[PDB]
């Protein structure tokens, strides 16, 4: 289920080595290490990210995400 579609507002590296991103006013975190460089690049370049998860409430965990350039 598509939880949030939008530009990354901010990213945050957490003490538990997870990574939070607030997309469309909702915060979502991921334990995936490979997503860390992918997400900040997306944040920096101004990519529109699509967060997909079974748990869609703000603060839920996620793993699947789609990256599309600004245009």
């Amino acid at each position, epitope marked *: 289920a598509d939880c949030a579609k939008g530009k990354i507002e901010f990213s945050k590296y*957490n*003490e*538990d*080595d*997870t990574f939070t991103v607030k997309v469309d006013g909702k915060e979502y*975190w*991921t*334990s995936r290490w490979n997503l860390q460089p992918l997400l900040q690049s997306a944040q920096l370049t101004g990519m529109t990210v699509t967060i997909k*998860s*079974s*748990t*869609c*409430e703000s*603060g*839920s*965990g*996620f*793993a*699947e995400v789609q990256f599309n350039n600004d245009l």
Partner: nanobody
Amino acid sequence: QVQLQESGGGLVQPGGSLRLSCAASGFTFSSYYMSWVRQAPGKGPEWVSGINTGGVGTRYADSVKGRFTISRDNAKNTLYLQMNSLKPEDTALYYCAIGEGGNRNYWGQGTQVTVSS
């Protein structure tokens, strides 16, 4: 092959405690972030707690922060949830999940936890 077996649920009085246990098999348990998710009747699924591999990095939902404590025994392939000072709003089916809990296919069959007087 992949199997998650939750246990430790039941009927608890408000203020009481419970220790949920989930016994994982069929995958290398030690290599996955594990989390607990609850599904309250009428409401949608709520992520509750998470633990990184290795068991140092814990995360908790604001609703349980300070009352619940996630742990893991990678030697025994088990995930635990210590639920202390239980409020009625904790009454839900508790699923033990592989990852961040964002994939229902990778949850167990849940353990029931009912808090009432």
